[PDB]
C-alpha cells in the first residue's frame, strides 16, 4: 500500500468512472459530507471504484453503480485513525478487537504491541504482524522501544538492543518506533536509548514519544534527540506547552476528566492545530464494550463541547499527515475509500462502514468475517511452580528489623519503619500491604520478591495479576500470605490472568491464557468478568481516589518510574540504578 491503488487498470477505470463514461462500484447517496479540510457540513455523494474514491460530486447527479449505500439522514466521514494504542490492554486477541472497532467507524490503528513484546520478544511482535495481516482493520505496528523498561532493574521475557530495534524497523509493516518511556535515558544520552533513536532515524520512520513530566529544557532535549510525539498530557497548560513545542499530539481518552480542559484550551485557541491527533492508548474490556475505541474519543470530545468538525479532523486528516499516508484520512477523489457514515455528530452511531471500498459493518454489526489466528505460541506463558504460603513472607534473622517501605500510590518514595520478627519471617508491619513479585517468564529464578507498601489502605485479602506494566510478571497485593496464594495460584494455573482472594475463598477470576495478558473469549465475556473482578477487589480494600484506585494495581512494577518500585528483582529505583535485594535495612 498505497501501491495497491496505483494499479493502472483500476486507475484508468477510476478516471473513466469519474468522467461518467463508466459506472462506479459504489455510490454513497444523500449524506452530509463532513468536509475535514474546510470544516463545512455539506451535501454530496461519493463514487468509489475498487479501493479508490473516484468521485466526490453534486448530490443526486448520478445513479450508475454496482451498489448504492444509503446515507440520507446522516454524515459522511473519512474512517477514524487511532494514532496510539495497545490491543493488549483490552484483553482480547486482535481479531476480537477489530470486530469491536471496525463496526464503529475505526478503519486504521497504530498499535505498539510492547506488551506482547516484553512477554515473547520479537516472537511476540511477529505474532501481531501475523495476527493483523488479513484483517479489515489496517494496523500499522510500531516497534516496542524499551524492552524491558529499565535494564538491570527487572527481567521480563525479552530484551531489545539497537540492533533488534534496526531489525524491526526494517519490516514493511512497522511504521516507526513506539513510545520511548525511558525519557531520562534519551535525555542524558544513554547509549542503548540513543542507538535505538539513531536507528529510528536511519530508517526515516516515526519516532514516538512518551513525555510525562517533561518541561522546558528536558522537553527540548527529547525532541532534539529526534522524538516527535506525545500522549502524556496532564493538563491544559500541559497541552499548550507541548503544542507550542511542535510535538505531534496524541490526545487520548484514558483520562476522561482532562478532556474538558483540553476542549477549553483548544476553544480558547480558536482553531484546531494541524498537529493534533486522537488516540485511545489503553482501554479496558468494559470500556471498549460500553463506550468504544477511537470512536468514543470523538464522542466524548463532542460531549465536552469540542466542535465535531475538529474532533473528526483530528481523528482523520491530521492522523493521515502524521503517518505520511496521504491515501487516508480525507473524502476526496484519488484517496482511499475508508469511509464511515454517522447517524449524527452527537452519538456517532455507525450506520455503515467501508475499508478499501468494501462494505464492512452495517448498523453496528460486521458484514464480513474476521480471520482468527493461531493463538498457540501465546500459551504456556506461566513458567513457575504453584506458589506456597511462605513465598509471600520475608524470612529475616533478628527478632526486630528495620524495613525499607514503598510509601505512596503512584508518587513513590522511600520510607521505613521498625518491625517485628518471629520464625525466620518478618511480621507484616501495621498499615502495610505486601507487594510480592515473581519472575514468571522462565528467563530467571522463580523467586517471590516481597516488599512493603504504604498508602494503600487495609487489605481484607489479596489481588494477583500477570498484567503488570511493562514486564507483566506475576504481581500480588495483599494483607495476608494465605489469601496471596489462593490468589496467585488461581492465576498461574489458568495460564495468567487476574484473581481476587478474600478470607480463604477466591472471589473472582478473569483468566488470560494468552501471554497472561489477553484471552480468547468473546469480549462480552471479558468485560463481564473484568466488571466482576473489580467488584471482588472493591470488597477487599477501600479505594480512596484518585491515586489509590484499582488501575494502580497494574502499575506498580513499572521500573522506569522515578521512585522506588518493587520488581521481580528487588526494589528498583531508577535514580540510584541499584536494586534493593532485601526490604530489611538492618538487624
- Binding to Fe ion, residues 99-118 (CB under 5 A): 115
Q: Indicate the residue among 178 and 518 with the shorter CB distance to a copy of itself.
A: 178
Stretch that binds a copy of itself, among 294-302, 323-331, 508-516, 555-563 (CB under 8 A): 323-331
Q: Indicate the residue among 171 and 547 with the shorter CB distance to a copy of itself.
A: 171
The contacts of residue 376 (CB under 8 Å, 6+ apart) are none
The least CB distance from residue 125 to a copy of itself, in Å, is 24
Q: Positive or negative, the Cα torsion across 217, 223, 227, 229?
A: positive
Host H or E run for residue 37: none
Reduced DSSP (H G I as helix, E B as strand, rest coil) percent helix, strand, coil of the chain, to 5: 30, 30, 40
The residue from 69, 128, 289, 317 that contacts a copy of itself (CB under 8 A) is 317
Q: Are 454 and 405 within 8 A, CB to CB?
A: yes
Q: Segment 429-488, which members bind Fe ion (CB under 5 A)?
A: 469-470
Q: Segment 144-203, which members bind Fe ion (CB under 5 A)?
A: 179
Q: How far apart are CA 297 and CA 315, in angstroms?
A: 9
The least CB distance from residue 83 to Fe ion, in Å, is 11
The least CB distance from residue 456 to a copy of itself, in Å, is 35
188 binds, among Fe ion, a copy of itself, none (CB under 5 to 8 A by kind): a copy of itself
Q: How far apart are CA 398 and CA 182, in angstroms?
A: 39
469 binds, among Fe ion, a copy of itself, none (CB under 5 to 8 A by kind): Fe ion
The residue from 168, 243, 432, 501 that contacts a copy of itself (CB under 8 A) is 243
Stretch that binds a copy of itself, among 12-20, 109-117, 380-388, 470-478 (CB under 8 A): 12-20
Q: Segment 262-281, which members bind a copy of itself (CB under 8 A)?
A: 269-271, 273-275
Q: Indicate the residue among 216 and 376 with the shorter CB distance to a copy of itself.
A: 216
16 binds, among Fe ion, a copy of itself, none (CB under 5 to 8 A by kind): a copy of itself
The residue from 4, 188, 369, 503 that contacts a copy of itself (CB under 8 A) is 188
Q: DSSP letters along 147-210, please?
A: SSSSBTTB--S----HHHHHHHHH-TTEEEEEEE--HHHHHTT-HHHHHHHHHHHHTT-EEEE-
The residue from 104, 205, 210, 408 that contacts Fe ion (CB under 5 A) is 210
545 binds, among Fe ion, a copy of itself, none (CB under 5 to 8 A by kind): none
How many other CB atoms sit within 10 Å of the CB of residue 383? Answer: 14
Q: How far apart are CA 82 and CA 90, in angstroms?
A: 15
210 binds, among Fe ion, a copy of itself, none (CB under 5 to 8 A by kind): Fe ion
For β-strands 339-342 and 276-279, DSSP reports them as unpaired
221 binds, among Fe ion, a copy of itself, none (CB under 5 to 8 A by kind): a copy of itself
Distance in Å from the first CA to the final CA of the chain: 66
The residue from 122, 166, 264, 332 that contacts a copy of itself (CB under 8 A) is 332
**Cell numbers 493461531 correspond to what residue?**
374
Q: Are 473 and 466 within 8 A, CB to CB?
A: yes
Amino acid at each position: 500500500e498505497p501501491a495497491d491503488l496505483n494499479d493502472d487498470t483500476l486507475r484508468a477505470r477510476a478516471v473513466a468512472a469519474a468522467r461518467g463514461d463508466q459506472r462506479f462500484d459504489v455510490l454513497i447517496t444523500g449524506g452530509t459530507l463532513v468536509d475535514v479540510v474546510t470544516g463545512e457540513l455539506r451535501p454530496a455523494d461519493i463514487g468509489i471504484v475498487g479501493a479508490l474514491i473516484a468521485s466526490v460530486h453534486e448530490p443526486a447527479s448520478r445513479r450508475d453503480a454496482a451498489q448504492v449505500i444509503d446515507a440520507g439522514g446522516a454524515y459522511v466521514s473519512p474512517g477514524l485513525i487511532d494514532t496510539h494504542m495497545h490491543i493488549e490492554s483490552s484483553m482480547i486477541t486482535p481479531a476480537a478487537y477489530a470486530a469491536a472497532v471496525v463496526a464503529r467507524g475505526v478503519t486504521t490503528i497504530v498499535w505498539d504491541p510492547h506488551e506482547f513484546g516484553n512477554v515473547h520478544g520479537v516472537d511476540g511482535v511477529r505474532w501481531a504482524a501475523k495476527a493483523i495481516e488479513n484483517l479489515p482493520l489496517r494496523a500499522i505496528l510500531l516497534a516496542p522501544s524499551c524492552v524491558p523498561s529499565a535494564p538491570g532493574l527487572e527481567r521480563g521475557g525479552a530484551d531489545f538492543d539497537a540492533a533488534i530495534l534496526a531489525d524491526l524497523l526494517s519490516w514493511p509493516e512497522i511504521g516507526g518506533i513506539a513510545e520511548i518511556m525511558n525519557m531520562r535515558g534519551v535525555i542524558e544520552r544513554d547509549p542503548r536509548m540513543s542507538g535505538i533513536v539513531q536507528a529510528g532515524l536511519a530508517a526515516e520512520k516515526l519516532v514516538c514519544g512518551h513525555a510525562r513530566g517533561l518541561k522546558n529544557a528536558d522537553l527540548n532535549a527529547f525532541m532534539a534527540a529526534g522524538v516527535s510525539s506525545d500522549h502524556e498530557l496532564v493538563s491544559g497548560e500541559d497541552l499548550m506547552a507541548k503544542l507550542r513545542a511542535g510535538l505531534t499530539i496524541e490526545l487520548r481518552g484514558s483520562h476522561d476528566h482532562l478532556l474538558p480542559e483540553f476542549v477549553a484550551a483548544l476553544n480558547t485557541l480558536g482553531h484546531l492545530p494541524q498537529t493534533v491527533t486522537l488516540c485511545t492508548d489503553d482501554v479496558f474490556p468494559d470500556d471498549l464494550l460500553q463506550g468504544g475505541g477511537l470512536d468514543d474519543v470523538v464522542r466524548r470530545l463532542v460531549r465536552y463541547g469540542l466542535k465535531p468538525e475538529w474532533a473528526l479532523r483530528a481523528a482523520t486528516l491530521n492522523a493521515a499527515q502524521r503517518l505520511g499516508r496521504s491515501d487516508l484520512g480525507l473524502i476526496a477523489a484519488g484517496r482511499r475509500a475508508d469511509i464511515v457514515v454517522f447517524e449524527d455528530l452527537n452519538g456517532f452511531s455507525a450506520r455503515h462502514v467501508l475499508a478499501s471500498g468494501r462494505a464492512v459493518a452495517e448498523g453496528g454489526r460486521m458484514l464480513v468475517d474476521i480471520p482468527t489466528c493461531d493463538t498457540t505460541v501465546l500459551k504456556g506463558s506461566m513458567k513457575l511452580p504453584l506458589r506456597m504460603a511462605n513465598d509471600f513472607l520475608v524470612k529475616s534473622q533478628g527478632a526486630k528489623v528495620r524495613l525499607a517501605t514503598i510509601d505512596r500510590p503512584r508518587f513513590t518514595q522511600w520510607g521505613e519503619t521498625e518491625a517485628d520478627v518471629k520464625d525466620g519471617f518478618v511480621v507484616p508491619p501495621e498499615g502495610a500491604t505486601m507487594i510480592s513479585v515473581t519472575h514468571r517468564h522462565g528467563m530467571a529464578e522463580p523467586t517471590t520478591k516481597t516488599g512493603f507498601l504504604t498508602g494503600w489502605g487495609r487489605w481484607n485479602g489479596a489481588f494477583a495479576t500477570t498484567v503488570s506494566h511493562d514486564s507483566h510478571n506475576l504481581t500480588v497485593f495483599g494483607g495476608n500470605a494465605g489469601d496471596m496464594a489462593l490468589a496467585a495460584n488461581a492465576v498461574i494455573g489458568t495460564g495468567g490472568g487476574m484473581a481476587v482472594a478474600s478470607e480463604g475463598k477466591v472471589t473472582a477470576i478473569l483468566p488470560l491464557p494468552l501471554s497472561g495478558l489477553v484471552s480468547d473469549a468473546p469480549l462480552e465475556e471479558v468485560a463481564r468478568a473484568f466488571e466482576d473482578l473489580r467488584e471482588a477487589v472493591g470488597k477487599v480494600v477501600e479505594w480512596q481516589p484518585p491515586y489509590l484506585v484499582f488501575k494502580a494495581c497494574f502499575g506498580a512494577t513499572l521500573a522506569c518510574n522515578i521512585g522506588p518500585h518493587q520488581t521481580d528483582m528487588g526494589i528498583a529505583d531508577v535514580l540510584t540504578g541499584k536494586v534493593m535485594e532485601s526490604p530489611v535495612i538492618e538487624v
